[model samples]
Target: AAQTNAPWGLARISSTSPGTSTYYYDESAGQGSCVYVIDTGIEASHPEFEGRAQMVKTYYYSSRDGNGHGTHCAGTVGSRTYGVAKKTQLFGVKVLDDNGSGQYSTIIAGMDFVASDKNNRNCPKGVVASLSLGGGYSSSVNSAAARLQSSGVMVAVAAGNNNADARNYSPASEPSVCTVGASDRYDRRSSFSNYGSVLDIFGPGTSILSTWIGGSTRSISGTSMATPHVAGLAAYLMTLGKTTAASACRYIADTANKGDLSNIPFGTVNLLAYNNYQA
Candidate 1:
């Protein structure tokens, strides 16, 4: 059975609306895909990862997840229990500091590394990069993301938590990348989620529970939490043969639950991410 005690976010995406308590998906959902957790760092040995997560590189900090933010994001992307792609491989690219913050230079460096690695065929198949951290607009960061996407990495990024227009943030503002906002279980825009024309889709973010450092779990909220759900879905789609970033993004947008959320600010896209699991 591909069913279990479903997290609300997982349960929400696997159905048409938000009333179900179980999540169902293909048994081979993320069998051969890869997700790069671009954040603080991942507690790679955490039980939730079941040995599937590992640190690939670090830019400004130790490989350990000092802030726990990256670990949580990694968990949502592919943890055994809380992930969107339960069987996908997780590779951490630590770009943030212990406070979950980093300079644009450092962040862009990480993006550059991923792009080069993929271009050189130094990565696994079906690459998806999940960025749960963002700041004010930076053309360098945006360009780096563009190059990464062109290098065949499905880039999913945070729409920020400022409750302002996401157009003011980099990577999220980059038109080529899939920018994500936070949605609640009741299908409402998360009160703190940034919105506006730049956002591509919404995903479960408020009160979302996932793996934390120290081999445990924590409930948190932010557009950061929502981005990985999209990344995971991208990986799952890749496993199902939407191999290119453009094609995967198209399928995700086309299959998303349209106009299903409330409190969406004007000018923002109303599509919520769906995994196409209709049980």
Candidate 2:
């Protein structure tokens, strides 16, 4: 087993909270809304997910289970109460498939599907897209992401778990995508979270407790967990009519708990204050 500690206190919260309770309860329960999760297929039967996830799209670019990486990432974004956007709709797009690897074109195809799906009258408006996977910066992907952003879709991406400068990755490093880094419960940046001036915001990512394969629970750590925290918050904001990607990003950035950004590197990048729109 991997050495671990409840980095973001998610495991502790799950253990103590009555039932599974996510940290995003300030707004409406995200009813009648949807977000796209482009990653590995989710364990649709997981109790934590409770069939809340809908596999609108699925593609296989690899053959391995990819060590269950996509499932873990999906759980964080929409795994019932265990997820950040529990009440919102999750459209699963299997770009990496069961295997952990994929081609750049395959990932792009998944993203294109998300962008195009928003235009279908059958789907909900103001859909946000969450991508927990990325590679070296690519012009094609960046261009595709830009088109999606212009089409009223918010994109939240993991800032890479490399613990290196943020300039190394593609979509996460891209300015158009809301790049999220991981922080511990103490609000300190996880030693593993990638950071740099390009970094947009931070979220709880250390030892997060989310649904896993086989309906089990596990504590995993990475910027992957943090990305959904922002994605979920974005979905919540959209439910309140803050529909555009820019508005959602502004809400998180302006409303984030502004402490010494230098000191608190991670943890709920405080948005509760921003949720107060009455001012």
Candidate 3:
């Protein structure tokens, strides 16, 4: 298993479209790090997670992954085979309802739960967070992200999928979070991905295959899939060394493969490439 360190994410999602699709299987699947996903929720029993999905809290009854979005994103973050950090722990901070929407206050409450439990796992500095859902700007959301960063937690948020400026959104616009956008196999911006200077980096999003409900595998699209790639990378970095919340974002940005994205209009690098971390 001692393969050379190749970044797991793909240059493109293959022609294979939906279920049974495959993405990158990273060299450094997360070790002891934990990535908390703030979205609809995750199926703790999903095989990809292997019980790594911690049911930290749910905003409503039976709101756990009926929508399948959170489970897919979490798999990209920390699934055993499909994730950016394959061995990293997974936790769900359910904010969205089964309908894939939630109140602003409920979303904020999810962050609070995550912040309170940041130290529960081995990550003393704080656990990593990935949010693939977003709405318009909210004061509480901004302050909560800032608070989490101050608490030594790094958050990865999706640039909205509406193809508008990410600055118009909430957690994606929040300075403390590493806002991620979607990229296709060809290093092109996803047509649905929102762009703007506010976004940090882009990752493989279209046709991204990860664990689904009922122990199945499925492909999904959006900046939602992209966010967890960054989150998993952040978690992977933690295993190599220690970093404060904001420092992790800086490390990722600074170590990114900017030269590879010569044609990208917004100048977002491929977030899934690990070689940029070193010569």
Candidate 4:
């Protein structure tokens, strides 16, 4: 059986009231920036996320009820009190269908849309794109991610939920993408989180709390929850004027807690010491 541990206690916020203090304190005061979320559609009406997210553009690649996964992830990264980057804008892109599945073509198409929208006159300049989905690495996906990177769009991808040594596909394995690994609140790498050289940084993934459908919230697991933590942090770093995906990634990695790798047995990986680096 896969090892199970509570890296971070997962919980959901019924209202933005509870998380607001931490959101302003950690994200707004730290980076003071905006970001784009390329994933399933956001709840859009959640009070915790009210006036917080910006749907610059939206694309529904599949025909299904928008699962609350993408919205939950967005809230964790961009929700006011519930997220890491409260001041950031979350550009929602529904790549996966309501069923939690999407084709490569659909996913890539969403990326293409984000890249092309970066230059739109009405959009924010130097926007960073966050991707929190994966199915292992693929050369074709990597090449596409490279193209977006060259276009000045920083991509953050989930390494994968599978507990394995091999790196996950497409965007995560892409050379230019920032691949994220999962760790619990105790700073231990999740047994189910994929790890390797391709892994860039670690964030809270265990039982993460965020927004859910109908303005309600719940806790869920997977690299999915962890991916947004890094994504939101990227937005915070960007607000500090750290443009470019590489720079944003470096900021997180450099500031992470470098300690024993025994807890996170995927070799030596840095865990974010959020308490010390809450600035």
Q: For candidate 3, what's the RMSD?
A: 4.5
Task: Indicate the residue-level lDDT of 251 in model 4.
Answer: 64
TM-score of 2: 0.81
RMSD of each: 1.5, 5.9, 4.5, 6.4
Best by lDDT: 1
Q: Pick the candidate with the highest TM-score.
A: 1
Clashes of 4: 12
Instruction: Give the per-residue lDDT digits (tens) of candidate 1, residues 1-279.
Output: 355777888887788878677877777658778888999999998988989898989986379998899999999888878888999988889999888889999999999888776554333448899999999999999998888888888999989999999888999899889999999989999999999898888989998889999999999999999999999889887887755665676678889999999999778989998978643
lDDT string, candidate 3, 115-230, tens digits: 88876667643478888888887778877877766777788888889888888888888877788888765566778888777787766676677888778888878988888887
- Cα lDDT computed for each candidate against the true fold: 0.87, 0.65, 0.73, 0.63
**Best of the two (2, 4) by lDDT:** 2
Tens-digit lDDT track of model 4 for 1-279: 011221132121111111121222333322334456767777776787767665555546432227888788888777765676665766677777776777788778877877887666232434666787887567777777777667776667777878765355667778677777776644567777877777777666777877887788778877777778777767665665555555666667776656523366646365542322322
Q: How does candidate 4 score on lDDT? A: 0.63
Worst 10 residues of 1 by lDDT: 116-125
Off-target runs (Cα >4 Å) in candidate 1 are 119-125
- Of the pair 1 and 4, which is ahead by TM-score? 1
TM-score per prediction, in order, is: 0.96, 0.81, 0.86, 0.82
